[PDB]
């Protein structure tokens, strides 16, 4: 790190509280989509949200001041500013931004973009020098005064300048799944002080595989030597010329409207107000997700059965009980060595996100001609006398080429199959019957002849035999301990979360409960089939499932075409304030004027009118509903 200088004054300037308008929209995915509405839960700036009216540097006799603060990163940062002086040069991201942690660096000059991620030691007020090159009459960077040490770089990127060429440039910085996603957009404006109203779907610039924890940031500025004079004076530089404006992304739900060009034109937050949330319900609140599966288990022994050196005959199909293990089906589904892959009830994909009580493994060897009849509901000697699949089979059936396995010089006649059985095998039945079959009225007593025949015949699968005659291995997976990957995350109580238990998913609040599920019950439900509570594995504790703060959301809408003003109906609550306004955000829970308690429930804001009118849009309890350019309510008339 460079030698650091003390420029910040003890005098502090207070922050401000102003609106974000409708800025900060960026593309959630790179998949080309057009004229489609996409819902997503990710990090964003809500509309009308708190953005601070910061001043990076401010000159307040000739008295001048300098106060460049430090802000944490949390989940994500949105930045934009109105400046064409290029004094704003870059940013730093990371956790502490000292030499203790790996940190990323982006470099931009008149030539190109340079990126490096070494162990940098950043000063409290990092800066770069700039000077006027009078013979060529150009402002040029002089020296680097940010870091004197750079070790262990793991990424480098070179491209044309993006922040170079009243000038509003708007940038988005993310670091997700090891990729540092940078979204960029530039806009000339006709404003000075505030962030202008209106929408701007901000363009995705580039994704960069950095992969480092980031919890704090600070904007990078290039300070002129004028203030670097030994006094507190900046003779040739406006020590107040730089101001920044930063908002914090929050995990929120958004819907994106696409045009026929594939370009995003408008978006609506479900967390703006119930008036906005109305359009979310009609297509015209959670903050986090928690995932917990049965854990503390090893891997499942698929290789012990799939990759077995010796494979049993078809009439001797086996049972392996599979339990207390984690199963990875991607290596099985995506193996390039399985010609037959049919699953019933469950999809071939997303098996790694599913859990099962018990799984049975079926394995044998049959020829290519015998591959086709391996399916539920088939008929034949294998199907009727050797192996009968249940009609209601839940699982997968797998067959593939296994050609080069069971040949020998001199004839290999190991495997056999059944020709005679009086009755079909039941679903999941075993019969080891090998009695000498009687084909007549004379009891055979193990002696063959006319009407007395041996029920078993040796295959003798031969390599020189035809392709269909050649042995191909087949596997059936019976689904009744076993789960897909994901180490269970710790639990969080009293917070609105998206929960995923042992294959069951849902959203709500996890809290302690008194309902005692039976020692082998994992989930319990009340009336209307609502998952009321779940019992936590590895601790056998019971957690209640409470919806986040209530009331059914029914749309009372005149229509978007005429006006965007409607009313909210609370069916069976007293005038208890949405559980004492737990959120209290979003314009103070959407203004929390007139309170009109009805037999149909409690109503906020809408005036009650003494006289009655013909019913237009009912709310309940005899009251229907615009007039005086405002939302109105009145008792319905009977004629």
């Amino acid at each position: 790190s460079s030698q650091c200088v003390n420029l910040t004054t003890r005098t502090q300037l207070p922050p401000a509280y102003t609106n974000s308008f409708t800025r900060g929209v960026y593309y959630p995915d790179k998949v080309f989509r057009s004229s489609v509405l996409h819902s997503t839960q990710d990090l964003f700036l809500p509309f009308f949200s708190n953005v601070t009216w910061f001043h990076a540097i401010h000159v307040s006799n000739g008295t001048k001041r300098f106060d460049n603060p430090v802000l944490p990163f949390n989940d994500g940062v949105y930045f934009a500013s109105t400046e064409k002086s290029n004094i704003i040069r870059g940013w730093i991201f990371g956790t502490t931004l000292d030499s203790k942690t790996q940190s990323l660096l982006i470099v931009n000059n008149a030539t190109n973009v340079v990126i490096k991620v070494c162990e940098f030691q950043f000063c409290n007020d990092p800066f770069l020098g700039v000077y006027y090159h009078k013979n060529n009459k150009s402002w040029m960077e002089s020296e680097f005064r940010v870091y004197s040490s750079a070790n262990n770089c793991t990424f480098e990127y070179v491209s044309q300048p993006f922040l170079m060429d009243k000038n509003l440039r708007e940038f988005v910085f993310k670091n997700i799944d090891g990729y540092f996603k940078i979204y960029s957009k530039h806009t000339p404006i006709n404003l000075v002080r505030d962030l202008p109203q209106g929408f701007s779907a901000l363009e995705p610039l580039v994704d960069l595989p950095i992969g480092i924890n980031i919890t704090r940031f600070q904007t990078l500025l290039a300070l002129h030597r004028s203030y670097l004079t030994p006094g507190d004076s900046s003779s040739g530089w406006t020590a107040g010329a730089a101001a920044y404006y930063v908002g914090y992304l929050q995990p929120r739900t958004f819907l994106l409207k696409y045009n026929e060009n594939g370009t995003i034109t408008d978006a609506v937050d479900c967390a703006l107000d119930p008036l906005s949330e109305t359009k979310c319900t009609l297509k015209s609140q959670p903050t986090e997700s928690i995932v917990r599966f049965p854990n503390i288990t090893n891997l499942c022994p698929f290789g012990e059965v799939f990759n077995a050196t010796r494979f049993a005959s078809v009439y001797a199909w086996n049972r392996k009980r599979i339990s207390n293990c984690v199963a990875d089906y991607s290596v099985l589904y995506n193996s390039a060595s399985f010609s037959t892959f049919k699953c019933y009830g469950v999809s071939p994909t997303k098996l790694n996100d599913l859990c099962f009580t018990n799984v049975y493994a079926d394995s044998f060897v049959i020829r290519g001609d015998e591959v086709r009849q391996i399916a539920p509901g088939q008929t034949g000697k294998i199907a009727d006398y050797n192996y009968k699949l249940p009609d209601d089979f839940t699982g997968c059936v797998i067959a593939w080429n296994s050609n080069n396995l069971d040949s020998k010089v001199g004839g290999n006649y190991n495997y056999l199959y059944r020709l005679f059985r009086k009755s079909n095998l039941k679903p999941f039945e075993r019969d080891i019957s090998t009695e000498i079959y009687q084909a007549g009225s004379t009891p055979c007593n193990g002696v063959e002849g006319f009407n007395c025949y041996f029920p078993l015949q040796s295959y003798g699968f031969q390599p020189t035999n035809g392709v269909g005659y050649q042995p191909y291995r087949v596997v059936v997976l019976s689904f009744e301990t076993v789960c897909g990957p994901k180490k269970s995350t710790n639990l969080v109580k009293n917070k609105c979360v998206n929960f995923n238990f042992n294959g069951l998913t849902g959203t709500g609040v996890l809290t302690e409960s008194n309902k005692k599920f039976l020692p082998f019950q994992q989930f319990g439900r009340d009336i209307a089939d609502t998952t009321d509570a779940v019992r936590d594995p590895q601790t056998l504790e019971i957690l209640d499932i409470t919806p986040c703060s209530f009331g059914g959301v029914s749309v009372i809408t005149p229509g978007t075409n005429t006006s965007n003003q409607v009313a909210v109906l609370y069916q069976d609550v007293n005038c208890t304030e949405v559980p004492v306004a737990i959120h209290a955000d979003q314009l103070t829970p959407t203004w929390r004027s007139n309170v009109f308690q009805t037999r149909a429930g409690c109503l906020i804001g809408a005036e009650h009118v003494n006289n009655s009118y013909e019913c237009d849009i009912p709310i309940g309890a005899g009251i229907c509903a615009v007039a005086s350019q405002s939302i109105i309510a009145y008792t319905m008339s009977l004629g």
Epitope: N514, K515, K516, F517, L518, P519, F520, Q521, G524, D526, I527
Partner: antibody, heavy 121, light 108 residues
Framework: EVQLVESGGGLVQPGGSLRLSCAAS????????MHWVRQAPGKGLEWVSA????????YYADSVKGRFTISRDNSKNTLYLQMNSLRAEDTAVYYC??????????????WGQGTLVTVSS | DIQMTQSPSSLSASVGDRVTITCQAS??????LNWYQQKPGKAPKLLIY???NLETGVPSRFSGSGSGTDFTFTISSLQPEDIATYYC?????????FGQGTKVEIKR
Amino acid sequence: EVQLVESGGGLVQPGGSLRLSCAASGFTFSSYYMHWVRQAPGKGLEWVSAISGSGGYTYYADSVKGRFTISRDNSKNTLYLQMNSLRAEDTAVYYCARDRDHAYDWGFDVWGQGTLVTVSS
Amino acid sequence: DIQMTQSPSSLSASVGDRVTITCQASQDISNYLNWYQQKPGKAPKLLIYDASNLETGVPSRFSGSGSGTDFTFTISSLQPEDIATYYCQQWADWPLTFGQGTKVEIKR
């Protein structure tokens, strides 16, 4: 003394309706799990329904699913068994059945005496 | 559902003998099993719970054990008041089924 007297039993036509009463005394009927069990004339027992947490919750059998409804009450601490669309196999002596599963004991509570129910023409 | 095909349907022995009545099971209920005693025309009563633990006020001659798919239970010494038919219950979650019954009687 804990005593589960039953009332409401009697003769009902097929498809009829009836509410059975099991007054509870000697204990907090509003804090102990309480059940219903039926036992066919001359045959074994069969589980019917239960209140998971006295004062709330629900629990039915598939053999009584939709056809039959369980309910309790607060204050006077009485138990009810609402039968709808009764059948011939529904004929049995019925016991307003007990329960203590919520606590460490995994069994039931008292066994009141239980009273006959018959469905015939 | 859980099925228990108790055998024998009915057995008899003399006073003081040891009696074994078989409760089977369906799927590894471990030790979540309770026992019931029911006299003719009388309300059923517990005999052993947790597959090994006698309730208070229960004769020590009544005892049971087992896990998985076979549950033994013994009447160490038949008594004139031991006359009854005994039921083995399924205390597995999803509580659907009782025992089909084992009737015990006296040689005389």
